[PDB]
């Protein structure tokens, strides 16, 4: 072994683990790619670095000169943040003021310059403020995770290979929750090049299943269901779109912790749920499905993912 | 109000 | 690569990273052992498993038969929890009701049977309730991290080796914050057997520096400063006891995030601070010091570690 | 009251 030059060399190479008791009834086999083990708990630690790095290399940005700007009340904020911190880049993040406190404490801790927007305008308002800021900023540079090719390209260079080599090339299906689409599109493309028979299953909210003809709407599965088809997503690579409800995902996420000792985010419950359904299809007996667990569940303690246990925790008094 | 409150 | 049978096979083997801009002024070199990258963010994921596993092997416990009991409002609760979950053991945890909500939401999420005790009796009250419960429980089994040899033994088997092999055997000093002492004692002993010249530096709170003749007292560096010398700690292995204040640790922890992109717990700021001081001693020019970062800073969002950024986050309004 | 409020 060796010592990392810096935190950025710690990104990727996340572990693969088999789902045991939650996968009851499966004739197929399900392995989870724990992106929750990234330096900052999520898969965005990958694109956070990639998008920055790709700009540097293309000479588009210089530390302490360029001002990174990006609208996101999600994991991309953190990914970029910790990476900007290590590399010495000023980062500005926009997000609806709605987004709970805890989610700001973290970006601030990294020296992020936070700009909250009208909570009623959602991400649409955040995006505006971001471009408005871009216009105002001399050396401003917006990353645009849904447009930026460095997003899927990193998954094609790391995530995909990692899975291929980690499963021994035996992977039959790749289950991925679709947010920007960078993961399913990048990693998917690679796996497909290794084995054309590798099926890619995209996962979206039954409440906002737009890739299935559905109309966009609100759901609770943070991390996915953008309510629109991202530029980086390559729908042609998707072999099947599986839909999961917020409730399913939440129940699964909860089973993953209780039965597997895996404290995952709700979107992980989504992929886990889908992956398992697929693994239960008789024709898939013997097949290896790798589902991606995008984030660790501890960052979502305030969210609905823990409403039950949370109310229980507050309602409990001490025993003498 | 078109729901655009996603967390990505 | 291969696929983990279960989450427990994901424990250990944490990365080593160099501290760059926070180590300004050092003639020595400091590498941080990121235990924050454990499946559940802390070093206790190691002893959580070890103590369980060692009992199973010694035939002292059987899943679904034995009832694990342990008093702890710290990371040991989580470590044991996720491991008990995966292995199928009922776990009972006792801790002062004082301990913030978030710290319960997590144990509950793992199916832990939480028992809060008089907040005024601190851990002393938690320990009582625990033994009281042990007395009542037929197949009860208390782990006792401060007494249990499986605690340091795991660090001697994994943590230590990992460091030795990760530093190329070039490690000159090992800086460890002392809570139970299992890490510094287990890993320390091993490194010493590889090279008798490897110096071990223990870190304790200036506010509760008992290993330095100090009287026990209250500090904010969660994870260390137990206010008493644990059984598992082998003070004879310690080459020097470095003291750090809560403020130092907090400032360092904050610098680690802003300058290094490392969101660490306050106890990590402690070791980081100590390690750096040592690295700045002229006689140590060229030396490699490995400091342990026990936990990830996101689990401490409510604590004093983020009071500054936290108040700032709540005080900020939205921009139109 | 001897401070025993440690988090380990
Ligand atoms: C980004 C993200 C996803 C989806 O990954 P994409 O690569 O964007 O498709 C899922 N869950 C969480 C928590 C995410 O942050
Ligand atoms: C347990 C712990 C320590 C100290 O490690 P020991 O092996 O107990 O000496 C430090 N920081 C945190 C956050 C811990 O949980």
XYZ file of C-alpha atoms and ligand atoms in Angstrom:
686
model
C 0.000 0.000 0.000
C 0.850 3.717 -0.229
C -0.223 7.118 1.149
C -2.685 9.338 -0.686
C -1.285 12.681 -1.820
C -4.616 14.147 -0.780
C -8.272 13.362 -0.160
C -9.009 13.369 -3.913
C -6.905 10.230 -4.389
C -9.263 8.547 -1.896
C -12.275 8.803 -4.211
C -13.735 5.735 -5.891
C -12.777 2.081 -5.512
C -15.805 1.506 -3.296
C -16.582 -2.062 -2.034
C -19.124 -4.617 -3.197
C -21.228 -6.543 -0.678
C -23.871 -9.246 -1.027
C -27.414 -8.621 0.193
C -28.331 -11.584 2.336
C -31.607 -11.602 4.241
C -33.325 -8.738 2.426
C -32.894 -10.680 -0.793
C -35.082 -13.502 0.504
C -36.893 -15.188 -2.376
C -34.293 -14.268 -4.970
C -33.051 -16.941 -7.356
C -30.760 -14.266 -8.698
C -27.952 -12.755 -6.643
C -27.654 -9.111 -5.546
C -24.424 -7.288 -4.719
C -24.471 -3.661 -3.580
C -21.806 -1.180 -4.718
C -21.333 0.886 -1.566
C -20.799 4.455 -2.791
C -21.805 5.355 0.737
C -18.163 4.517 1.497
C -16.882 7.427 -0.582
C -14.742 9.963 1.317
C -17.896 12.037 1.824
C -20.534 9.285 1.912
C -21.900 9.586 -1.658
C -21.340 8.772 -5.324
C -21.077 12.492 -6.134
C -17.632 12.541 -4.619
C -16.741 11.048 -7.980
C -18.249 13.653 -10.295
C -17.451 16.417 -7.846
C -13.786 15.755 -8.560
C -14.155 14.744 -12.196
C -15.953 17.915 -13.268
C -13.393 20.090 -11.478
C -10.405 18.102 -12.679
C -11.615 18.001 -16.284
C -11.932 21.784 -16.342
C -8.446 22.250 -14.883
C -6.944 19.929 -17.448
C -8.841 21.667 -20.266
C -7.291 24.850 -18.826
C -10.730 26.331 -18.243
C -10.112 26.851 -14.510
C -7.301 27.803 -12.126
C -7.337 27.415 -8.323
C -7.683 30.693 -6.471
C -8.635 32.371 -9.732
C -11.782 30.629 -10.923
C -15.029 30.693 -8.934
C -16.966 27.440 -9.080
C -20.735 27.864 -9.127
C -23.422 25.172 -9.083
C -27.116 24.941 -8.117
C -27.696 21.883 -5.967
C -29.349 21.014 -2.699
C -28.037 17.489 -3.130
C -24.880 15.420 -2.738
C -23.225 17.224 -5.650
C -22.803 20.217 -3.371
C -20.752 18.161 -0.914
C -18.835 16.315 -3.621
C -17.720 19.591 -5.201
C -17.204 21.216 -1.830
C -14.713 18.842 -0.238
C -12.871 18.651 -3.577
C -12.817 22.432 -4.041
C -11.533 22.694 -0.467
C -8.640 20.327 -1.066
C -7.788 21.917 -4.433
C -8.207 25.532 -3.354
C -11.215 26.706 -5.363
C -13.882 29.131 -4.213
C -17.217 27.348 -4.447
C -20.642 28.951 -4.520
C -23.689 26.757 -4.037
C -27.313 27.713 -4.594
C -30.309 25.864 -3.195
C -33.842 26.577 -1.989
C -33.753 28.006 1.510
C -36.138 25.149 2.261
C -33.309 22.598 2.411
C -32.862 21.710 6.104
C -30.141 23.270 8.258
C -27.877 20.228 8.558
C -27.354 20.288 4.792
C -25.836 23.768 5.045
C -23.711 23.186 8.138
C -21.750 20.740 6.028
C -21.133 22.900 2.959
C -20.223 25.811 5.219
C -17.797 23.597 7.126
C -15.937 23.218 3.806
C -15.814 26.949 3.212
C -18.611 26.918 0.661
C -20.233 30.251 -0.107
C -23.911 29.369 0.288
C -26.707 31.271 -1.415
C -30.239 30.269 -0.517
C -33.053 30.957 -2.953
C -36.846 31.297 -2.746
C -38.013 27.965 -1.233
C -41.159 28.308 -3.341
C -39.169 28.338 -6.574
C -37.476 25.038 -5.765
C -34.438 24.161 -7.852
C -35.740 26.355 -10.655
C -35.097 29.384 -8.459
C -31.737 28.010 -7.388
C -30.725 27.553 -11.014
C -31.669 31.122 -11.850
C -29.739 32.642 -8.965
C -26.799 30.483 -10.055
C -26.706 31.810 -13.609
C -27.363 35.298 -12.285
C -24.270 34.845 -10.126
C -22.374 33.398 -13.084
C -23.196 36.525 -15.073
C -21.914 38.702 -12.215
C -18.776 36.655 -11.541
C -15.676 37.515 -13.656
C -13.992 34.115 -13.385
C -17.245 32.308 -12.726
C -17.598 28.722 -13.893
C -20.776 26.661 -13.598
C -20.322 22.889 -13.618
C -23.793 21.761 -14.729
C -23.913 18.128 -13.635
C -26.803 17.348 -15.963
C -24.954 18.774 -18.961
C -21.307 18.139 -18.055
C -19.802 15.115 -19.876
C -17.198 14.719 -17.166
C -20.071 13.372 -15.080
C -20.689 10.096 -16.930
C -17.124 9.952 -18.246
C -15.823 9.397 -14.720
C -18.206 6.496 -14.160
C -17.071 5.052 -17.460
C -13.465 5.333 -16.297
C -13.821 4.234 -12.695
C -17.219 3.071 -11.455
C -17.791 0.811 -14.444
C -14.320 -0.799 -14.450
C -14.489 -1.252 -10.672
C -17.745 -3.173 -11.020
C -16.523 -5.241 -13.933
C -13.354 -6.264 -12.097
C -15.097 -6.635 -8.750
C -17.730 -9.056 -9.987
C -15.159 -11.081 -11.876
C -16.837 -10.057 -15.118
C -19.780 -12.191 -14.031
C -22.250 -9.305 -13.692
C -25.500 -9.954 -15.563
C -27.420 -6.828 -14.632
C -26.610 -3.334 -13.419
C -29.336 -1.610 -11.387
C -28.927 2.166 -11.125
C -31.095 4.908 -9.670
C -31.208 7.756 -12.170
C -30.572 11.292 -10.972
C -28.328 12.950 -13.540
C -27.874 9.616 -15.296
C -24.101 9.904 -15.250
C -23.655 6.634 -13.358
C -25.977 4.388 -15.359
C -24.765 6.013 -18.608
C -21.048 6.054 -17.869
C -20.655 2.758 -16.015
C -23.385 1.204 -18.133
C -21.609 1.967 -21.406
C -18.390 0.388 -20.158
C -19.967 -2.805 -18.844
C -21.823 -3.093 -22.163
C -18.486 -2.855 -24.023
C -17.106 -5.671 -21.881
C -20.195 -7.837 -22.336
C -23.004 -6.852 -24.690
C -25.276 -9.136 -22.687
C -25.036 -7.036 -19.553
C -28.520 -5.598 -19.005
C -28.841 -2.111 -17.535
C -31.856 -1.354 -15.387
C -32.637 2.271 -14.624
C -34.672 3.069 -11.529
C -37.079 6.003 -11.234
C -39.934 7.018 -8.903
C -43.355 5.601 -9.614
C -44.448 9.150 -8.647
C -42.286 10.766 -11.332
C -41.717 7.919 -13.817
C -41.007 10.099 -16.865
C -38.831 7.566 -18.699
C -41.892 5.300 -18.684
C -44.262 7.812 -20.246
C -45.070 9.220 -16.836
C -45.600 12.872 -16.046
C -43.109 14.481 -13.625
C -44.233 14.957 -10.036
C -43.064 15.108 -6.400
C -41.520 12.096 -4.647
C -39.341 11.591 -1.553
C -36.556 9.469 -3.044
C -33.839 12.125 -2.777
C -31.150 11.720 -5.397
C -33.356 10.680 -8.291
C -36.581 11.620 -10.072
C -35.407 14.940 -11.530
C -38.691 15.167 -13.426
C -36.909 15.526 -16.777
C -34.484 13.621 -19.011
C -30.896 14.929 -18.323
C -28.501 15.564 -21.208
C -25.862 13.204 -19.834
C -28.392 10.352 -19.666
C -28.233 8.045 -22.666
C -31.621 6.354 -22.646
C -30.507 4.096 -25.506
C -28.229 2.250 -23.088
C -31.098 1.458 -20.716
C -32.467 -2.060 -21.134
C -35.393 -1.602 -18.731
C -36.800 1.103 -16.463
C -37.918 -0.169 -13.092
C -40.238 1.958 -10.999
C -40.247 2.074 -7.216
C -42.397 4.048 -4.799
C -41.119 6.259 -2.011
C -42.685 3.840 0.455
C -41.007 0.783 -1.089
C -37.615 2.473 -1.056
C -38.083 3.644 2.519
C -39.102 0.225 3.701
C -36.192 -1.373 1.893
C -33.731 1.235 3.195
C -35.021 0.327 6.642
C -34.701 -3.408 6.046
C -31.157 -2.916 4.770
C -30.207 -1.415 8.123
C -32.091 -3.835 10.406
C -31.335 -7.064 8.526
C -28.036 -6.242 6.788
C -26.473 -3.650 9.045
C -26.426 -1.306 6.036
C -27.513 2.253 6.892
C -28.367 3.491 3.397
C -30.093 6.512 1.912
C -33.623 6.221 0.561
C -32.390 6.115 -3.062
C -30.373 3.035 -2.093
C -33.586 1.435 -0.892
C -34.871 2.209 -4.378
C -32.116 0.383 -6.255
C -32.099 -2.378 -3.637
C -35.849 -2.854 -4.098
C -35.593 -2.899 -7.895
C -32.512 -5.139 -7.928
C -34.285 -7.625 -5.676
C -37.471 -7.661 -7.780
C -35.342 -8.456 -10.827
C -33.417 -11.091 -8.868
C -36.729 -12.742 -8.003
C -37.740 -13.234 -11.642
C -37.418 -16.998 -12.289
C -35.691 -16.508 -15.645
C -32.925 -14.729 -13.726
C -31.978 -17.643 -11.503
C -28.201 -17.675 -11.102
C -27.741 -14.087 -12.314
C -25.576 -11.494 -10.567
C -27.128 -8.063 -10.226
C -25.109 -5.128 -8.964
C -27.196 -2.326 -7.519
C -25.635 1.002 -6.585
C -26.090 2.400 -3.071
C -25.484 6.152 -3.853
C -25.282 7.409 -0.264
C -25.003 6.607 3.445
C -28.186 6.977 5.467
C -26.754 9.151 8.248
C -26.958 12.340 6.161
C -30.736 11.923 6.030
C -31.582 11.768 9.752
C -34.042 14.657 9.478
C -35.796 13.333 6.357
C -38.838 11.058 6.161
C -36.529 8.059 5.985
C -36.376 8.157 9.792
C -39.741 9.670 10.711
C -40.729 6.493 12.536
C -37.588 5.855 14.561
C -37.206 9.624 14.980
C -40.563 10.251 16.627
C -39.844 7.193 18.746
C -36.501 8.656 19.798
C -37.983 11.978 20.858
C -40.899 10.374 22.653
C -38.668 8.219 24.866
C -37.954 9.273 28.451
C -35.230 8.031 30.785
C -35.393 4.986 33.052
C -34.225 5.285 36.655
C -45.556 25.778 -9.328
C -44.028 22.838 -11.209
C -42.313 20.643 -8.604
C -38.556 21.186 -9.032
C -37.551 20.354 -5.487
C -35.165 17.492 -6.244
C -32.030 16.713 -4.232
C -29.164 15.904 -6.555
C -11.388 -8.044 -6.421
C -14.257 -9.995 -4.823
C -17.663 -9.479 -3.165
C -18.041 -9.214 0.596
C -20.121 -11.963 2.190
C -21.571 -9.248 4.392
C -20.963 -5.797 5.838
C -18.606 -7.220 8.493
C -16.060 -8.148 5.816
C -16.018 -4.440 4.893
C -14.504 -3.385 8.224
C -10.921 -2.175 8.465
C -8.375 -1.584 5.711
C -8.968 2.157 5.949
C -6.853 4.555 3.780
C -3.879 6.732 4.649
C -3.688 10.331 3.428
C -1.082 13.067 3.802
C -1.960 16.308 5.579
C -0.844 19.097 3.301
C -1.661 22.694 4.170
C -2.633 22.183 7.810
C 0.813 20.734 8.400
C 2.462 24.028 7.468
C 5.726 24.443 9.364
C 6.321 20.728 9.792
C 9.752 19.315 9.010
C 8.235 15.963 9.827
C 5.512 14.378 7.715
C 1.948 13.591 8.832
C -0.316 10.922 7.350
C -3.858 10.434 8.643
C -5.384 6.957 9.009
C -8.977 7.620 7.972
C -11.091 5.432 10.269
C -13.847 7.823 9.291
C -14.019 5.626 6.178
C -15.169 2.602 8.169
C -18.537 1.140 7.102
C -20.159 3.242 9.833
C -17.782 6.222 9.922
C -15.705 5.300 13.010
C -12.887 3.159 14.386
C -15.345 1.359 16.684
C -16.654 -0.558 13.721
C -13.522 -2.584 14.355
C -14.008 -3.445 18.021
C -17.754 -3.631 17.570
C -17.168 -6.686 15.403
C -14.120 -8.019 17.222
C -15.778 -8.167 20.638
C -18.838 -9.905 19.187
C -16.845 -12.274 17.010
C -14.446 -13.212 19.809
C -17.353 -14.175 22.053
C -18.960 -16.284 19.321
C -15.723 -18.108 18.674
C -15.181 -18.661 22.410
C -18.718 -20.106 22.317
C -19.891 -17.553 24.860
C -22.638 -16.212 22.571
C -25.122 -17.449 19.966
C -27.132 -15.272 17.549
C -30.804 -15.036 18.421
C -30.039 -16.550 21.809
C -27.626 -14.166 23.498
C -28.561 -10.573 24.343
C -25.718 -8.112 23.876
C -25.643 -5.305 26.426
C -23.282 -2.329 26.603
C -23.316 1.163 28.164
C -22.163 3.720 25.626
C -23.305 7.034 24.253
C -20.403 6.873 21.827
C -19.333 5.245 18.570
C -19.145 1.828 20.231
C -22.929 1.777 20.232
C -23.017 2.116 16.445
C -20.109 -0.258 15.881
C -21.835 -3.000 17.875
C -25.219 -2.116 16.448
C -24.575 -2.485 12.731
C -22.574 -5.654 13.466
C -25.271 -7.124 15.720
C -27.784 -6.311 12.980
C -25.850 -8.166 10.306
C -25.135 -11.127 12.610
C -28.592 -11.352 14.160
C -27.987 -10.424 17.798
C -30.326 -8.471 20.041
C -28.445 -5.416 21.260
C -29.315 -3.262 24.245
C -27.577 0.077 24.650
C -27.624 2.331 27.695
C -26.720 6.010 27.715
C -27.659 9.208 29.541
C -30.925 10.557 28.195
C -28.895 13.725 27.685
C -27.266 12.377 24.512
C -28.864 14.271 21.599
C -31.677 12.793 19.509
C -29.697 12.123 16.331
C -27.501 9.685 18.254
C -30.545 7.539 19.036
C -32.187 7.699 15.615
C -29.176 5.796 14.354
C -29.066 3.000 16.930
C -32.824 2.580 16.601
C -32.490 2.381 12.823
C -30.357 -0.733 13.436
C -32.941 -2.312 15.698
C -31.079 -1.463 18.884
C -33.069 -1.638 22.099
C -32.245 1.741 23.640
C -32.420 2.437 27.357
C -31.823 6.006 28.448
C -30.595 6.705 31.960
C -30.606 9.692 34.331
C -28.790 12.457 32.379
C -27.457 13.701 35.716
C -25.711 10.403 36.416
C -23.780 10.534 33.151
C -22.125 7.306 32.056
C -22.011 6.151 35.664
C -25.796 5.869 35.598
C -25.707 4.228 32.189
C -23.240 1.641 33.457
C -25.442 0.823 36.425
C -28.590 0.368 34.366
C -26.525 -1.850 32.063
C -25.411 -4.231 34.799
C -28.895 -4.098 36.282
C -30.167 -5.238 32.889
C -27.417 -7.854 32.697
C -28.581 -9.245 36.032
C -32.164 -9.409 34.734
C -31.283 -10.878 31.335
C -30.982 -14.712 31.145
C -28.644 -14.830 28.147
C -27.296 -11.357 28.780
C -23.730 -10.581 27.768
C -21.968 -7.281 28.434
C -19.035 -6.471 26.158
C -17.121 -3.981 28.324
C -14.919 -2.169 25.818
C -12.595 -0.895 28.531
C -12.076 -4.391 29.923
C -12.497 -6.578 26.830
C -9.160 -7.788 25.369
C -10.764 -8.268 21.981
C -10.686 -4.475 21.790
C -6.921 -3.953 21.506
C -6.365 -7.413 20.028
C -8.208 -6.383 16.870
C -6.028 -3.304 16.448
C -2.996 -5.505 16.923
C -4.289 -7.809 14.192
C -5.585 -5.265 11.709
C -5.083 -1.569 12.434
C -1.426 -2.007 13.331
C -0.507 -4.237 10.360
C -2.436 -1.948 8.005
C -0.385 1.026 9.170
C 2.893 -0.841 9.032
C 2.258 -2.035 5.478
C 0.686 1.235 4.379
C 3.610 3.403 5.419
C 6.093 1.006 3.881
C 7.434 0.278 7.351
C 8.747 3.837 7.370
C 6.519 5.059 10.215
C 8.498 6.821 12.948
C 5.666 7.850 15.238
C 2.098 6.768 15.895
C -0.221 9.457 17.283
C -3.391 8.097 18.893
C -6.216 9.720 20.822
C -6.920 7.587 23.876
C -10.495 6.621 24.670
C -10.459 2.969 25.694
C -6.814 2.719 24.670
C -7.449 -0.314 22.497
C -6.076 1.365 19.372
C -2.856 2.826 20.764
C -2.276 -0.367 22.798
C -3.133 -2.909 20.120
C -1.711 -1.200 17.036
C 1.077 0.303 19.115
C 2.293 -3.077 20.359
C 2.449 -4.450 16.823
C 4.318 -1.512 15.312
C 6.755 -1.732 18.237
C 7.365 -5.422 17.422
C 8.134 -4.486 13.822
C 10.427 -1.623 14.817
C 11.370 -0.976 18.436
C 12.174 2.591 17.428
C 8.589 3.417 16.562
C 7.476 6.000 19.130
C 3.870 5.947 20.322
C 2.270 9.227 21.303
C -0.967 9.115 23.263
C -3.276 12.116 23.113
C -5.519 13.250 25.972
C -7.451 16.420 26.884
C -5.557 19.173 28.631
C -8.827 19.441 30.622
C -8.679 15.805 31.741
C -4.984 14.921 31.335
C -4.911 12.058 33.853
C -2.022 10.160 32.252
C 0.060 13.282 32.901
C -0.725 13.529 36.602
C -3.828 15.543 35.844
C -7.128 15.240 37.650
C -10.120 14.069 35.568
C -12.568 16.718 34.401
C -15.021 17.689 31.636
C -13.877 18.350 28.060
C -15.586 18.444 24.648
C -13.289 16.122 22.694
C -15.815 13.299 22.297
C -14.171 9.914 21.979
C -11.367 10.431 24.468
C -10.695 11.723 27.979
C -12.535 8.986 29.889
C -11.227 10.487 33.125
C -9.646 7.188 34.197
C -7.031 4.685 33.013
C -8.841 1.822 31.120
C -7.824 -1.797 31.692
C -7.072 -2.404 28.020
C -4.677 0.566 27.943
C -1.050 -0.438 28.376
C 0.609 2.765 29.528
C 4.016 1.069 29.324
C 3.764 1.144 25.532
C 3.230 4.912 25.466
C 6.390 6.864 24.671
C 4.860 10.303 25.289
C 1.492 11.773 26.258
C 0.551 14.846 24.282
C -2.163 17.122 25.603
C -4.559 19.110 23.450
C -7.368 21.472 24.394
C -10.934 21.263 23.158
C -10.378 24.564 21.376
C -7.201 23.377 19.629
C -8.893 20.200 18.443
C -11.946 22.107 17.255
C -9.875 24.607 15.360
C -7.810 21.853 13.795
C -10.903 19.798 12.921
C -12.159 22.933 11.201
C -8.891 23.530 9.364
C -8.858 19.910 8.216
C -12.178 20.481 6.469
C -11.477 23.936 4.988
C -7.868 23.347 3.909
C -7.788 19.570 3.357
C -11.359 18.735 2.461
C -11.373 16.361 5.448
C -14.583 16.561 7.505
C -13.341 14.982 10.737
C -14.637 14.605 14.271
C -13.229 16.752 17.059
C -11.061 13.884 18.377
C -9.434 13.776 14.937
C -8.584 17.442 15.338
C -6.938 16.353 18.580
C -4.636 13.756 17.028
C -4.062 16.001 14.010
C -3.029 18.852 16.312
C -0.704 16.641 18.360
C 0.766 14.900 15.308
C 1.528 18.271 13.742
C 3.159 19.666 16.899
C 5.427 16.616 16.966
C 6.110 16.970 13.238
C 7.216 20.551 13.870
C 9.923 19.559 16.359
C 13.244 20.136 14.536
C 14.730 16.837 15.713
C 11.883 15.129 13.850
C 12.724 16.479 10.415
C 12.123 13.734 7.861
C 9.994 11.605 10.204
C 6.672 10.024 9.242
C 3.923 10.355 11.816
C 0.642 8.523 11.410
C -2.232 10.060 13.327
C -5.576 8.291 13.602
C -8.771 10.085 12.562
C -11.305 8.021 14.652
C -14.502 9.382 13.092
C -16.160 11.390 10.319
C -17.362 14.856 11.269
C -20.911 14.533 9.924
C -22.126 12.585 12.973
C -21.337 15.617 15.130
C -23.399 18.314 13.379
C -25.255 19.200 16.579
C -22.134 19.329 18.774
C -19.919 22.327 19.530
C -17.686 21.354 16.627
C -20.099 23.233 14.352
C -21.510 25.896 16.670
C -20.024 28.638 14.508
C -21.073 27.447 11.066
C -24.331 26.193 12.596
C -25.490 29.515 14.010
C -24.449 31.033 10.698
C -26.578 28.509 8.823
C -29.687 29.202 10.875
C -29.225 32.953 10.744
C -29.105 33.051 6.937
C -32.190 34.071 4.960
C -32.912 33.561 1.268
C -31.882 35.849 -1.586
C -34.431 36.758 -4.254
C -21.376 14.756 40.561
C -18.072 13.470 39.166
C -18.106 14.195 35.422
C -18.652 10.844 33.673
C -20.259 12.203 30.536
C -17.788 10.817 28.000
C -18.718 9.668 24.494
C -16.956 6.428 23.679
C -26.666 11.560 -7.676
C -27.460 10.602 -6.776
C -28.142 9.479 -7.351
C -28.186 9.082 -8.828
O -26.964 9.014 -9.549
P -26.829 9.616 -10.983
O -25.417 9.307 -11.340
O -27.061 11.074 -10.848
O -27.781 8.975 -11.883
C -28.844 8.668 -6.463
N -28.910 8.882 -5.094
C -28.243 9.969 -4.543
C -28.368 10.124 -3.028
C -27.532 10.805 -5.395
O -26.895 11.861 -4.803
C -13.108 5.223 20.499
C -12.823 6.626 19.944
C -11.521 7.207 20.099
C -10.305 6.578 20.781
O -9.935 5.254 20.422
P -9.548 4.195 21.503
O -9.229 2.991 20.686
O -10.753 3.995 22.342
O -8.399 4.664 22.269
C -11.354 8.485 19.573
N -12.350 9.200 18.924
C -13.608 8.630 18.773
C -14.640 9.487 18.043
C -13.817 7.356 19.285
O -15.073 6.840 19.113
